[PDB]
Amino acid sequence: HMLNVGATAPDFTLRDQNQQLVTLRGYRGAKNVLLVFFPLAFTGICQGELDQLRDHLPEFENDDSAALAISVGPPPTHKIWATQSGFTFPLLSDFWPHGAVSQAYGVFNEQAGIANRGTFVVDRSGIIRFAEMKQPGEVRDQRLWTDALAALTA
Amino acid sequence: HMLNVGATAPDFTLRDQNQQLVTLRGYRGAKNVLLVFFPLAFTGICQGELDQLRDHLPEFENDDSAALAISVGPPPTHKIWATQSGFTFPLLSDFWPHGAVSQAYGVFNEQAGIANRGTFVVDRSGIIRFAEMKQPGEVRDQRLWTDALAALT
């Protein structure tokens, strides 16, 4: 099942949309990390969620916080989507092995082969301090994300 | 790994870019099928190959022949690419299980998690009658596809 608050966040090294390696442990001791798992690029609900993250980026990518969007797509998919959508934050490929990081966080839909709408905040110690999992057909409330992030600055 | 000529073509049922199910077996007795495997949507060499196919579509999609392009990408990826590129032929998703059909045809790159640039012609009996895979630099020779197809009518 989904990892809950108090668990150590599984570490990972994934390619971003520009093929650079991004590792979760690299933020430890420096920033709180918002992990935004999403099902599929070029779909309507995903578009809306990541458009909203784009529109409010300074709340998620600053001196205290970092945001990483994760899905099973490979980098060329995430690159074209990011370019066409104006996304400048990292989109990470859980592509091969397929959904392995999703599976480690307990947010992989084993029937569909896609991550659910899982969201986590990982504190500077690497412990999960916010956890949620919505289904692909549901929409998340991003005020919950900013509120969790805010509580780990002060 | 690649299946050679004379082998029975593994049957599949995959979603196309509009989420419709396409099954190889449905062409048996009716059409020769060209199977164009490709690594990734939105890449350069894939683009050029499938653009050639678009530009020559009546040679590949007619009363005697059908063409199916196959990669590991899911339908929304294929839908956006297809729409942007004018691909009106089926792009099929070997997505989940990841590359299972590609594996069955012996054209899966296990290290990278993508299909290689393999091509097959399947006759009206379901037998592989043409099998092609080019070097990493090299774009496939589509006159060859139309020649193989032409030999089977």
Author numbering:
A (entry chain B): 0 to 153
B (entry chain A): 0 to 152
Question: Could you share sentences copied from the article?
Answer:
To test our approach on structural coordinated atoms in space, we used the active site environment of the peroxidatic sulfur of peroxiredoxin AhpE, a single cysteine enzyme. AhpE reduces H2O2 to water but no H2O2 is present in the active site of the AhpE structures. Method 3, however, only finds the interaction with the water molecule, not the Arg116. It is predicted that stabilization of the Cys45 thiolate by Arg116 will promote its nucleophilic character, so that this Cys represents a catalytically active state of the enzyme.
The crystal structure of AhpE shows 2 dimers per asymmetric unit, which are denoted chains A and B17. In chain A, the side chain of the conserved arginine residue (Arg116) is oriented away from the cysteine and directed outwards to the flexible β9-α5 loop, whilst in chain B it is turned inwards to the active site cysteine. After this re-refinement operation, we repeated the simulation with the newly refined structure for chain A and found that after 30 ns the helix α2 remained intact. Importantly, a gauche minus conformation was found for the peroxydatic Cys45 in the active site of chain A after re-refinement, which is in line with the conformation reported for most of peroxiredoxins. In the active site of chain B, most H-bonding interactions are intra-protein, involving the side chains of Thr45, Arg116, and the backbone amide of Cys45. In the case of chain A, however, the H-bonding network is much more dependent on water molecules, which, in their mobility, provide a less stable H-bonding environment. Beyond that, our results confirm that chain B, where the conserved Arg116 is located in the surroundings of Cys45 active site, is the reactive conformation for H2O2 reduction.
